[PDB]
Amino acid sequence: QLVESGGGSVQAGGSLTLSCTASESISKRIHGIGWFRQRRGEQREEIAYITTGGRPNLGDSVKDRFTISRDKSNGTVYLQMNSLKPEDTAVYYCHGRGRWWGTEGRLDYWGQGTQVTVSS
Amino acid sequence: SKVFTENNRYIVKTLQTDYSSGFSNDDELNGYIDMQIGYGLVNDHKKVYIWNIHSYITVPFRAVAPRCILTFPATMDESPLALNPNDQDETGGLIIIKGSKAIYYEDINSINNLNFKLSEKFSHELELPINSSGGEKCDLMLNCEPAGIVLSTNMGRIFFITIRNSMGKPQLKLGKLLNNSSVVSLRNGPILGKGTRLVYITTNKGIFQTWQLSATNSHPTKLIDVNIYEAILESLQDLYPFAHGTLKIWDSHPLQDESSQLFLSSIYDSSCNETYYILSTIIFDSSSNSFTIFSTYRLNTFMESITDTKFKPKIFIPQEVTSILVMFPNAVVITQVNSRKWEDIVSLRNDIDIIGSGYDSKSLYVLTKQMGVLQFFVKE
């Protein structure tokens, strides 16, 4: 299982930290951990990713505001969301980029998804 | 008999055979070597020339050049009878794909130097559904006995052909169609018992299939049917974004453990006109029809484009350390890995032409038009 934590409601300019905790077996079947944002009536979109080796990557819409890091002591991956905006309001999914591939394509892992709401 | 180089990585030497560079007045020669049958073959536009690898037979078939493959002699495994005197002279057979007509000679001994009119009466023939009008032609051929023979065409069609019935008697039957697009690799897998073996098929689109083929009244089954193209592209795109639109799959080869394959691909960087050859090791899970890329290596000693549209580079993997040989038009690159990577190259002179290859458990054999057979033995 992928497990995600840290969602909630803040005001514009506030800050939240999401976390993603992966089991041993899943961590073996993925290249990295990422986060997808889904505003409502929109599709999911990847906004942050960090390889197992700690190489971080941020989408253009968040890269000056959010930070993605890993704690190597437990492998937990953190998305620290600073400088929040009303348009950051969305469900956020943590995501494991799979190493295995099937008939339907790459076999990825998803968290259950957590709500972030930013009011102005 | 003549060693040209021996170092602690490899030996390159000649293999004295009955091949002769004066079989034909024709520069263009098709051919290959079957070390397991013990014979080599070249053909031009008129005749196929069959020669022993241990120190020949001319079969006129008359245009573009046909595609020819050798077959094993009629074996009778585990008979209670004393062997015949005369059964120790059968040498094996010959299949010629002329256009849409497959021609099978069970025994080449009886057709030596016979004009085609009359030798054709010794053959079994099979009309294959090949669109010669539209430009379709035979491309690759694999001898996958005891199951039979697999043909591909330049337009992606794959025929499984049987050459015995259920009782060892020679025939020529289209067993099954196994289906711009084109097959890049036909490879033998393990024998599974009486008349049955696996065959691996790779297309240039990245489709990889494992087929269970049988001469024994069974009908073909796919055990694996996956597409590896995007996975390989993803393994490359971060360091080599020019892989997008240039990734090309050239060959594949099974590994030891029967569940993994090695694939040979290339990508091209137009900024500096470098072609980069990629070795991708892929593990397949038969249960779930899925795979993963275990490892990716780029060749460092050979970055040339293959501009001969006919030449197809070919992998050889001897049957710890894993050795991967890749034969290019005028070089053989040797890669070794702990079963750190390291890489050697054997560069050939540019005025010799490779016209086919063969292999045994330890060595790659390269048929050159001008100098005969060269053996590349990698030390393990």
Side-chain angles (χ1 to χ4, degrees), chain A, chain B residues 1 3-15 17-61 63-75 79-87 90-193 195-216 218-309 311-319 321-380:
Chain A
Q1 265 201 323
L2 281 183
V3 59
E4 48 191 0
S5 193
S9 305
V10 298
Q11 306 288 332
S15 167
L16 288 170
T17 303
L18 306 185
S19 72
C20 171
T21 314
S23 76
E24 62 151 351
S25 45
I26 287 176
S27 277
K28 300 303 294 187
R29 299 193 50 124
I30 66 187
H31 294 272
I33 290 286
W35 299 84
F36 282 61
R37 167 185 72 202
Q38 175 161 44
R39 300 183 185 99
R40 85 177 78 205
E42 284 178 37
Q43 280 173 351
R44 288 178 283 105
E45 177 197 352
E46 181 171 34
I47 64 158
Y49 177 81
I50 187 155
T51 73
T52 52
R55 272 169 305 298
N57 183 251
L58 295 159
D60 290 319
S61 68
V62 306
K63 70 187 186 178
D64 298 302
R65 308 186 287 124
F66 298 3
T67 308
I68 186 173
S69 57
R70 173 185 311 272
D71 192 333
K72 267 175 35 153
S73 73
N74 55 10
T76 299
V77 169
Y78 294 86
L79 182 71
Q80 184 179 129
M81 289 163 100
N82 294 297
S83 306
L84 286 163
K85 292 172 180 184
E87 55 265 32
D88 290 322
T89 292
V91 183
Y92 287 78
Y93 298 90
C94 60
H95 180 264
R97 183 186 296 181
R99 295 169 160 289
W100 286 83
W101 291 71
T103 181
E104 317 283 333
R106 201 178 62 222
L107 301 165
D108 297 327
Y109 301 82
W110 292 96
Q112 289 296 268
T114 185
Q115 177 73 45
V116 173
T117 311
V118 188
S119 313
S120 180
Chain B
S1 293
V3 175
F4 302 110
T5 303
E6 165 154 18
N7 55 46
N8 287 351
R9 186 78 61 248
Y10 58 82
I11 299 170
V12 186
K13 66 184 201 183
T14 55
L15 181 67
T17 77
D18 283 348
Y19 172 80
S20 163
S21 74
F23 282 152
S24 188
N25 294 353
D26 207 45
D27 301 316
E28 307 72 61
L29 282 189
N30 294 12
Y32 78 113
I33 314 163
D34 198 314
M35 295 310 284
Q36 290 68 42
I37 302 181
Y39 287 78
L41 174 158
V42 288
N43 61 95
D44 53 18
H45 290 94
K46 283 77 175 179
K47 299 160 167 195
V48 62
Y49 301 84
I50 301 165
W51 38 278
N52 208 311
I53 63 168
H54 320 272
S55 298
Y56 55 92
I57 296 139
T58 293
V59 184
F61 49 69
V64 304
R67 304 287 296 135
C68 314
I69 197 164
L70 307 162
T71 64
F72 284 85
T75 67
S79 172
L81 312 176
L83 280 75
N84 202 9
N86 286 82
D87 277 312
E90 63 182 358
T91 58
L94 168 71
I95 296 188
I96 314 184
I97 313 300
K98 205 203 281 192
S100 66
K101 198 160 80 183
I103 306 159
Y104 171 37
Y105 295 105
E106 200 262 311
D107 172 288
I108 54 182
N109 275 332
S110 50
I111 66 169
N112 181 41
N113 295 105
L114 284 178
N115 70 94
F116 191 61
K117 295 297 291 185
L118 206 59
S119 85
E120 165 156 47
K121 278 146 180 294
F122 291 97
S123 78
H124 308 90
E125 315 180 326
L126 173 56
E127 205 84 20
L128 296 164
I130 290 165
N131 195 12
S132 294
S133 306
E136 193 166 18
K137 73 182 90 158
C138 182
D139 195 336
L140 308 174
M141 321 193 54
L142 172 66
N143 180 300
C144 57
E145 297 187 62
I149 282 176
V150 174
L151 273 78
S152 70
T153 72
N154 55 353
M155 291 179 184
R157 270 204 285 152
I158 312 177
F159 312 121
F160 171 53
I161 286 159
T162 50
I163 68 174
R164 274 93 177 94
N165 58 12
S166 301
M167 297 321 198
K169 306 272 178 198
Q171 71 182 3
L172 207 57
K173 282 191 176 255
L174 174 73
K176 200 186 188 75
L177 264 71
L178 313 183
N179 311 101
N180 183 263
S181 159
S182 76
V183 179
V184 292
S185 188
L186 296 178
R187 291 278 190 195
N188 271 332
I191 305 186
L192 293 193
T196 312
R197 95 181 294 143
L198 306 178
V199 170
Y200 308 115
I201 302 185
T202 305
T203 80
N204 57 336
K205 296 274 177 67
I207 295 149
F208 178 80
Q209 294 181 335
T210 294
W211 279 91
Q212 186 165 310
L213 307 176
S214 195
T216 300
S218 191
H219 284 147
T221 316
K222 271 181 298 192
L223 309 176
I224 281 175
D225 187 6
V226 305
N227 189 307
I228 70 186
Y229 192 86
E230 172 73 21
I232 287 168
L233 176 67
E234 266 170 44
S235 80
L236 296 166
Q237 63 191 11
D238 298 324
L239 291 174
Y240 313 115
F242 51 80
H244 277 95
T246 69
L247 178 59
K248 170 176 199 335
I249 301 196
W250 289 97
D251 197 22
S252 78
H253 197 295
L255 292 173
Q256 279 280 100
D257 53 25
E258 309 193 350
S259 82
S260 55
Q261 305 275 337
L262 174 80
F263 293 86
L264 167 70
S265 307
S266 69
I267 57 184
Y268 178 74
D269 178 6
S270 65
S271 282
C272 53
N273 184 47
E274 302 285 8
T275 306
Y276 297 122
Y277 292 89
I278 307 303
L279 299 176
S280 307
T281 300
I282 301 191
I283 296 172
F284 291 89
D285 173 31
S286 296
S287 308
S288 64
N289 188 44
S290 53
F291 68 90
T292 186
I293 294 195
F294 177 77
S295 79
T296 300
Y297 304 111
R298 193 197 43 95
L299 303 188
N300 297 296
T301 61
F302 185 93
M303 284 62 74
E304 293 188 23
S305 66
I306 290 153
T307 44
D308 179 358
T309 314
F311 188 88
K312 38 182 187 172
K314 190 176 284 187
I315 301 152
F316 168 71
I317 299 180
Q319 293 307 116
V321 183
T322 292
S323 300
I324 303 157
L325 282 70
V326 179
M327 168 191 96
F328 291 113
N330 287 271
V332 179
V333 173
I334 304 177
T335 306
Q336 290 191 322
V337 303
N338 291 296
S339 190
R340 303 178 191 272
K341 161 191 92 86
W342 55 96
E343 184 184 338
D344 301 68
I345 192 170
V346 183
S347 293
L348 311 181
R349 55 200 275 173
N350 288 327
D351 60 341
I352 58 180
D353 303 291
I354 296 182
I355 61 174
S357 74
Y359 61 93
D360 58 22
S361 49
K362 295 307 171 174
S363 303
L364 165 67
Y365 300 91
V366 167
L367 178 61
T368 74
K369 182 177 182 293
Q370 295 88 358
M371 300 194 190
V373 181
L374 314 183
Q375 187 186 346
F376 293 78
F377 169 70
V378 57
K379 296 184 179 177
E380 293 216 299

